[PDB]
Amino acid sequence: STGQHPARYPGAAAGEPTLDSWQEPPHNRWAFAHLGEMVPSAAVSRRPGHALARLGAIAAQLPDLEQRLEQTYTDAFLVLRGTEVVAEYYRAGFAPDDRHLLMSVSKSLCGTVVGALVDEGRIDPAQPVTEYVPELAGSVYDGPSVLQVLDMQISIDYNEDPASEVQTHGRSAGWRTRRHGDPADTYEFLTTLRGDGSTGEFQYCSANTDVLAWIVERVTGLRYVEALSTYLWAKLDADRDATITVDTTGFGFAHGGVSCTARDLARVGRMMLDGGVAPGGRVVSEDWVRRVLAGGSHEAMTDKGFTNTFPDGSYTRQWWCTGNERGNVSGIGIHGQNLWLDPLTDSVIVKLSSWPDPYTEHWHRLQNGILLDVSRALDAV
Amino acid sequence: STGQHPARYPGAAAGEPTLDSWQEPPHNRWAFAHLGEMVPSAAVSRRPGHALARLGAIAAQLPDLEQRLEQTYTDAFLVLRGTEVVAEYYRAGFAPDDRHLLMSVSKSLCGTVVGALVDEGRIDPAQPVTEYVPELAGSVYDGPSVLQVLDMQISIDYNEDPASEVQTHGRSAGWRTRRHGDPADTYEFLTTLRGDGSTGEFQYCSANTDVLAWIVERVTGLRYVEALSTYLWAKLDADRDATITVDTTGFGFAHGGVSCTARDLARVGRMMLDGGVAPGGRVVSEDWVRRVLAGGSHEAMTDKGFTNTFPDGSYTRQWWCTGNERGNVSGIGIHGQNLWLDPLTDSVIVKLSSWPDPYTEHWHRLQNGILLDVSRALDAV
């Protein structure tokens, strides 16, 4: 009852293959070349224990930086000033070209794909979600515009407990073990969501991003996995593929499931600071980038977890906007992931971490202190 | 009750993380860098529909070769003569550097890791399995020697039906959806296997290979995933990592779950034809390679599915030995996978396929006809 979705391969029936059918024809021709999409899998290294610290260049201004990175459970850290990597750190056991889960930094990538389709004129943010996904009629997404999804200004009953929406979302998508009665896939889960109908106030909700990805699929006919490549990743001249977890229908977990190298993630920030243009072509319009850097409605932003640090902060198009004197904007994910933009110095900071906790005021204070200190260390003196 | 297994990461508790714990500390530091091991995942391509045929060189002697490859559902085909790639074919939609499931060609890789440890003197094939895995006491593997496992000369009640051992094996390992009452992981499944106690006659049984991998783990303390890299893959100077599916404990599906590129698989054959030496060092002893090329006991080989084509054929150390006038030896997997060795011409043939059926006399007749014709086309004239 969630309508048409992109086939896993040319000619594939809806929902095929499953874990129980991938060995059967005609599925197996695709599945034998993509088994990691069906079954958890490990890398067998073609290459035959110590942290790598190359802090520049900025170590002089920040003498305790490595210790501060350790204290915030830093796995990978990279500073790109212009086109140059000017500082790097990787923990023991994490290689420079290893990939790392982005958590909700993934949202900023999804919003970028939406922006690309807006630039092409295939998505109109002013239109209701239901213009593109009619099957969301009767849900909390019946009424709101695509832009309100992009800016997360929809009131939704979404508890952040196995009954909670946050965990149910993960179970529906394959991040956790299914419980009886759980929705079959991410699309079905989204249709179960309800709200009081009010809009205009910021409410951070991961369901919003997956609705964006669903819209992307309905507009392009591409699996979100492929759309993320076609409209973004394949234009970055990246060193490695990214990866994204998929649910049982092959739907990429758009709001949280992307992994990539720190250096490659920085290429996304480089594109944003280059007016939307990447090596392989324009990704989003100059106007789109300008609107991201400008911020969203301040009055909509009532999250004290953000405004206590950034009083004039806001959120738009899947980016957090600090509204600070530097105009910093960042993708953010739980456990300490940031794609942090510092336009003043034409720099991008990537920090990928694994805090023991998904979020505390403690971790965010420390994390933001590092990103701000590093940004300021990049200023001309 | 299956004893000690290699930790998923340094300091990890037994069996941790699971699908339901990987986001929690201390698991998440590892899991965020290896999420594909926990959750099905898709590649997001860094690169922005037609078959590639470069048959040489041998096309003159085999005018209908491409059609014959199409007819046998060929996905990737590569001929390595000496150190030179002299013929290649890839179907539309499969790139030269795409990876392909090996099915039971994986067994020949596992046997190679065992051989490496025999060369080091850490495994004695004459010793009983229980010398290395005491927990297999009380099972069909209580009594037989490691060599009898290597040569698959153990009588086992193993039905090839959800009650059948073949499918139960897959469910225990995560290739299929679990049923209530199923063993928790591959180790537990292996301990459930029984037989009449007789040995000496060939019985092809995939459980044998996973017992070999278990022995490898007990002897080295390494996850089989890592052992496969350390003792084989990392010495090949391969273009890409291989991958291997893992069960819920992280145990690689040794008997069938490896994927790699055709070119890289050929490097394994190159090593065998180079007396056991690879670019990164010796993998197995000269003696081990000699014993593989020599074949196993012919009298043990009573599989008419093999001997009808190869009357003097046999099996040893996880390789099929044709016993034909060319001394051909091959790794073989269902749906048309071969790592085929042609020592006469110092050549390796890789054929990776997706037949609609796992096995029929029809497909094997066609497949072997191609491998033999190609081998003969390589002869000096």
Curated annotation (Swiss-Prot), chains A, B:
Alphabetical list of InterPro entries matching this protein: Beta-lactam-related (IPR001466), Beta-lactam/transpept-like (IPR012338), Diverse_Enzym_Activities (IPR050789)
GO terms, molecular function: 6-aminohexanoate-dimer hydrolase activity
Entry keywords, A to Z: Hydrolase, Nylon degradation, Plasmid
Catalysed reactions listed for this entry: [N-(6-aminohexanoyl)](n) + H2O = [N-(6-aminohexanoyl)](n-1) + 6-aminohexanoate; N-(6-aminohexanoyl)-6-aminohexanoate + H2O = 2 6-aminohexanoate
Enzyme class, spelled out: hydrolase
Pathway in which the depicted protein is active: Xenobiotic degradation; nylon-6 oligomer degradation
Keyword Mitochondrion assigned: no
Pfam family for this entry, one: Beta-lactamase
Residues annotated as catalytic: S104
BP GO annotations: nylon catabolic process
Misc: The EII enzyme is 100 times more active toward the substrate than the EII' enzyme.
PANTHER family, per the entry: BETA-LACTAMASE-RELATED, BETA-LACTAMASE-RELATED DOMAIN-CONTAINING PROTEIN
Protein name in the entry: 6-aminohexanoate-dimer hydrolase
Gene giving rise to this polypeptide: nylB'
